Paper text:
Notably, we obtained a structure of a fully glycosylated Sing/16 at 3.9 Å-resolution. We observe density for core N-acetylglucosamine (GlcNac) moieties in our cryo-EM reconstructions at all PNGS on both HK/68 and Sing/16 except at N122, which is within a well-resolved region of the protein, and N8, which is near the N-terminus and is part of a poorly ordered region of the protein. Of the glycans detected, however, we found that HK/68 possessed on average 67% complex, 15% hybrid, and 16% high-mannose type glycans, while Sing/16 possessed 49% complex, 9% hybrid, and 28% high-mannose. N165 is the only conserved PNGS present on HA’s head shared between Sing/16 and HK/68. However, N165 switches from being mainly complex in HK/68 to being mainly HM in Sing/16. The HA plasmids contain either one or two N-terminal superfolder green fluorescent protein (sfGFP) domains, for HK/68 and Sing/16, respectively.
HA is a trimeric glycoprotein with each monomer composed of a globular head containing a vestigial esterase subdomain in its lower portion, and a stem domain17. Each subunit consists of a membrane-distal polypeptide (HA1) and a membrane-proximal polypeptide (HA2).
Numbering used by the authors:
A (entry chain F), C (entry chain D), E (entry chain B): 7 to 171
B (entry chain E), D (entry chain C), F (entry chain A): 10 to 326
Write the structure that this text describes.
């Protein structure tokens, strides 16, 4: 895909979208449904989904000015144990969350692509670069019909198949 | 025909994050999950912060003349300073740390004077090591009992708890520097102090001898405490060396604590206090300190953790 | 997909399956291989895969009737630390397990779809609603052949391609 | 042509679960992972449950007259009740909690009487504060030694451990209310009790004085213990105030413990016991209590956790 | 897929690759880009990505020769708590890491397949067994062109479409 | 036409791993994450390993005649052996475990002799229970003070810390077996030892009586310690039973520790030491022991954990 080859530095009205070329020239528009879906999943994740702030008050002493022996050794041990475990949880959590963010945003891109491909049916071919070659004249009203989910492939097959084969 | 290209946005300069499969991947945006800095100041809201200026909590508890301003004071967080010092009759507290913890978590120094009657003894003795005003003095919450005339009776006093709360009694034992002091001070070759309740007792035997000189004195006072629950009774028995209670501290339960910090206190609002000052609590983790109070982020070793807030950044080229 | 548009409240003989319409009327049958595969993965996960019950006997005291000082403070601290860490593990684990259950069951649905699509080859088109339009007469014996993995696309291409193009 | 539609089932009413990407997603089925309730009763199988009815473990250990039914008793779990009370000579146990832990984990009160010989003293003294039958009495596992005629010798007794197990000895020290009791009871102005082994020793000095009155007595007994390993020797030296051992408790290791609960015990089977009663152990987590015994679910804060057991539920509409 | 039906015990020059049959006979070659990508992800994961060795020195005592009471009970409790939590982390981590390894290597196989399919465009059909049927004569130079990403589908459509339809 | 087949490799014999969705899946390759074995030997590099052969750390600290080889010795890890034994005047250390921890973490027995002056007493007393050479002796770092002629004065000695480091003083208290020993040894019916600083004090009262015989002696010595910080002062006051310090141990902070092990030490290099011997640290987890020192893998319960290093293995058939 074209979305593997690169992203668009020129797209500022959304995260995912369409770019096109036809007889009326070129243009661009964001897809707001896939943009919002990716955003909602992320905003949820950045919030307190599996963790929250706990309020704590009186606790053990963590710093000492004197050498005491066994009790102090245990208090230090307990605190170091707690820190190592929370530091671990923080590494694993961030790597898992980042792994899921990359995967959900790549998936939203692929979903838009498959969604488009099945709307077009046999009237278009996948060029291997994130683009569909549409085999019939498709003007700006047609491109918007594809973009908003109303493209009717049955009014184009007679032309599109003649151009494909 | 026509071409319809699908894609996603990119940014001129993204940021790197770590995943399970990749050590460094560039993304459009990322946020920071570790709070690594403080304001350097402690906020005085929403928590009640009590700056012990030159006092420790125990000196404030006992009644050191420089800590007279903390009588009947309350706090959510008591703050001790490195400049704090004592300036009264030299003392020690066996298990100092536990008494400091009990008082800190109670959250108050509210003190109620009780009608203890000590007969056959001289009440309110002081020292030039604890000056109060221009003359001699002593800790304000303690009563140093000495001989009266030529005698010192065995004191047997009963103080029942007919209230609906726990009473904390602070008392101590005097340790003379010599055999020539203990028999001129409370006319007794071998003193003992016994303090008891219906459930437990503590008996302390004074130890005679010179210690290093502190504020001109080679003698010491040891501080002990007992808690009397509703329905129980406090009994004090002594034949010398009693630094008597003057009443009790009212005990409470709650969110109160203690911290050691040299940070200044200001007019700002923050729910999380560390000894380096207040910090924001809008991130799940912090690496400012391990010692925290209130609604704080978890302490971690990492100075930084980046959480992707967007997709992979793939520049146009 | 049709499996995104909705599920079937009328399917009770399995989790995944087929519904069809042909010259003999309509019908429905569950796919038992994908149903069982999803079930086996789930039954494993609901079992002691990464966790088990531990048997414990003598332990520290966790409740107190008196104010003791340092040892009690440490005992409480140790227990609160343990609880916060296990409560965290429970949140993360359940969210991860649920994330994997949704993903494995969506994937089994997509696998059945791709499996069907390649059996049909060029004799059918993906209509974008979880359905394949079959371009040749396909009676109830044909539909079962597709369902049990024995459909021979080579005996239909001559008809199916004439109807597609 | 023909249409072949692929799909999956749905249910009229599904349930909501949480995932990494979604806060609430409806699924066909979900199970509950937190056990949030108990039966309110403790099961007497498979574990051996010993209901101390009005006894604490220490009163059962010492031999309080109301606890005579627990002599040589065993348990996997000893259950203390809030109604438990003591009714014998008033006592205290320094480090009570450790003795309670030692006995609870041993799991037995098996007691073996030993031929200790105490000469020149009166054996088996009692009190009206610990009535046994119609007259005076004392703890059944202790021997209160007092003067004989006009004297009280220093007692020096040796009891070697030639067995292949550890022996637990319980002994104590009497604390008279007055100078007029200690010299009429064991003719000694200053008593001491020393108990030792080849590795450690304990010396206790009695403390004279009135405590609050408990069951008519202002006096107290302090309880101490020592463990003698195979090859070691127990030596007891005293010149007054000895509450002598009568033998030893056999120590064991194992799964035994102690719990505080007011729940009744019944004829049912359950591997997990909490103070709120037995709970099922078919879920990985519970929020019934933090105090548990046996094959129990992990304690968590959450009252509920739903685990999807199926796919997303998407209704037909 | 053919990569579901089986792997190749005869492939030793890489992890992923191609096997072919044409007018010049048969042959085999590994795909080095997908082989290295799978390896790099794995070598990273097998390294200290979310965990590292900590160096520890003085610590609490963990074994005892005497019965002490409360402090010993707490020390044992603290150590058992630490072990149960790290044992849990080890089970969850290994199962998660293995889940990701299987998923990334299955995905690299599917990526190579889709990559090939879009290079071939309409000149080949997916046979449902991990194979593409190429509908034009394709000699050893052609097969290498497909393998190294230089196949030009526009010089074959005229032949390939005649053979497909 | 032509056929282009895509696929991946397989191996004749793969290995099984566990995933989230599968309990056992065969993969081409897998590695082992739990180190389950040791060499049975402790490596003497990179850490400095000190084999106490028949000594414990405390006997080495006190100066037991068999431990004279450990004077002024240092270590990163002190290794105690099960064969270690004491052979000197019988002793006990209240809170033994804390002293053992303090010394072990300091990492050194460097000892500096100080000019303590003890007047009116006989210095350097010994015993046949601690032979040094052909005659009687005592612990090398302690000074047993006894009467001189017919008297024993109260000793009052001051030793200030004018250095820039902490000083550890080890001292003790003698416990005679009888009243006929304490008045012939240090002419005193009731001895006491008080050791103090500007911040704390310890007073010990000797306990007279026979203990089980150890090496021919029924008497004992108790060991106590104190730490004097820069600017502080050590003061010792006694009227009998003082086992005097001869100087101080220099305290340090660092990586030093102590382990109990019967494993031999050899000429190899390993960063991770367990009591079963050194282990490799190239795996994240180990199940060799819970007791470890240095750059060690985490201890887990599992004996094995397999991490896939490759893809699913699907044989040709
Ligand atoms: C989609 O776009 C076309 C062309 O602009 C318009 O006629 C049609 O009404 C739009 N449909 C929807 C659902 O917005
Ligand atoms: C990216 O950041 C660097 C500084 O780290 C700066 O020099 C460079 O100009 C920035 N590039 C863009 C496109 O913003
Ligand atoms: C990216 O995240 C930061 C927070 O670190 C935020 O301030 C910024 O506005 C975000 N930018 C975009 C493009 O959303
Ligand atoms: C402290 O509170 C008590 C409450 O009864 C009151 O009697 C006492 O005078 C108060 N002391 C000070 C210093 O305000
Ligand atoms: C004991 O020594 C101190 C010095 O610490 C000295 O000030 C004091 O006068 C001495 N007292 C006696 C009993 O000689
Ligand atoms: C504040 O943070 C620093 C680390 O930069 C730490 O050394 C210091 O101890 C912290 N504050 C206090 C007074 O604990
Ligand atoms: C598949 O179904 C057809 C039609 O019912 C039947 O003839 C064929 O034998 C079945 N094959 C298998 C493998 O069950
Ligand atoms: C779903 O549950 C609600 C109660 O929460 C009930 O009123 C409703 O009838 C149920 N619907 C179905 C389809 O079972
Ligand atoms: C759904 O799970 C519950 C357990 O919570 C079980 O009782 C019920 O039988 C399950 N139903 C189905 C449809 O499997
Ligand atoms: C307890 O067991 C011992 C075992 O020797 C026995 O001698 C003693 O009589 C038993 N006591 C009771 C109350 O059963
Ligand atoms: C000591 O006080 C108590 C009240 O607690 C009293 O019963 C007892 O008789 C008094 N004894 C003396 C020595 O007067
Ligand atoms: C039983 O659970 C309740 C919470 O509902 C708790 O308050 C109580 O302490 C528990 N039982 C006991 C006796 O510990
Ligand atoms: C691909 O292979 C063909 C045939 O061997 C060769 O002519 C061509 O130059 C190769 N291209 C690349 C990029 O290696
Ligand atoms: C696989 O291992 C078994 C032993 O577990 C051995 O007998 C068998 O021959 C091996 N097979 C292959 C193909 O290496
Ligand atoms: C498989 O992993 C092992 C380590 O357990 C390694 O020794 C071996 O060389 C690896 N084999 C392959 C095929 O990479
Ligand atoms: C130990 O070190 C000190 C350092 O001043 C030195 O005086 C003393 O003689 C040394 N002792 C031994 C046994 O080497
Ligand atoms: C005390 O008993 C011991 C045996 O432990 C004996 O050796 C010693 O001589 C006895 N001493 C007295 C005071 O009779
Ligand atoms: C060495 O491992 C074994 C388990 O096989 C364990 O029993 C032993 O205690 C360990 N070594 C030591 C001396 O701690």
């Amino acid at each position: 895909a074209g979305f593997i080859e690169n992203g668009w530095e020129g797209m500022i009205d959304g995260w995912y979208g369409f770019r096109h070329q036809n007889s009326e020239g070129t243009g661009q528009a964001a897809d707001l449904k896939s943009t919002q879906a990716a955003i909602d999943q992320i905003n949820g994740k950045l919030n307190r989904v599996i963790e929250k702030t706990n309020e704590k008050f009186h606790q053990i002493e963590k710093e000492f000015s004197e050498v005491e022996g066994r009790i102090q050794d245990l208090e230090k041990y307990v605190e170091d144990t707690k820190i190592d475990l929370w530091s671990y949880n923080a590494e694993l959590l961030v790597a898992l969350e980042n792994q899921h963010t990359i995967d959900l945003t790549d998936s939203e891109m692929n979903k838009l692509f498959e969604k488009t491909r099945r709307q077009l049916r046999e009237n278009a071919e996948d060029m291997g670069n994130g683009c569909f070659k549409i085999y019939h004249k498709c003007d700006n009203a047609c491109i918007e019909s594809i973009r908003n989910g109303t493209y009717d492939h049955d009014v184009y097959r007679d032309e599109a198949l003649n151009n494909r084969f | 025909t026509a071409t319809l290209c699908l894609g996603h946005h990119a940014v001129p300069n993204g940021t790197l994050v770590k995943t399970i499969t990749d050590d460094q991947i560039e993304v459009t945006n990322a946020t920071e999950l570790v709070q690594s800095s403080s304001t350097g100041k402690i906020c005085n809201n929403p928590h009640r912060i009590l700056d012990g200026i030159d006092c420790t909590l125990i000196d404030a508890l006992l009644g050191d003349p420089h800590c007279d301003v903390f009588q009947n004071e309350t706090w959510d967080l008591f703050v001790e300073r490195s400049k704090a010092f004592s300036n009264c009759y030299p003392y020690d507290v066996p298990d100092y740390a536990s008494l400091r913890s009990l008082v800190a978590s109670s959250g108050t120094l509210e003190f109620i004077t009780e009608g203890f009657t000590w007969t056959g003894v001289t009440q309110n003795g002081g020292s030039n090591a604890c000056k109060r005003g221009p003359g001699s003095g002593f800790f304000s919450r303690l009563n140093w009992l000495t001989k009266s005339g030529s005698t010192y009776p065995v004191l047997n006093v009963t103080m029942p708890n007919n209230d609906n709360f726990d009473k904390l009694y602070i008392w101590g034992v005097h340790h003379p520097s010599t055999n020539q002091e203990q028999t001129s001070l409370y006319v007794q070759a071998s003193g003992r102090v016994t303090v008891s309740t219906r459930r437990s007792q503590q008996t302390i035997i004074p130890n005679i001898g010179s210690r290093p000189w502190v504020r001109g004195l080679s003698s010491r006072i040891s501080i002990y405490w007992t808690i009397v629950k509703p329905g129980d009774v406090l009994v004090i028995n002594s034949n010398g060396n009693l630094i008597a209670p003057r009443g009790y501290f009212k005990m409470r339960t709650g969110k109160s604590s203690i911290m050691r910090s040299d940070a200044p206190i200001d007019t700002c609002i923050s729910e999380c206090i560390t000894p380096n000052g207040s910090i924001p609590n809008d991130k799940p983790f912090q690496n400012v300190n391990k010692i925290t109070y209130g609604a704080c982020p978890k302490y971690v070793k990492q100075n930084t953790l980046k959480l992707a807030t967007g997709m992979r950044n793939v520049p146009e080229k």
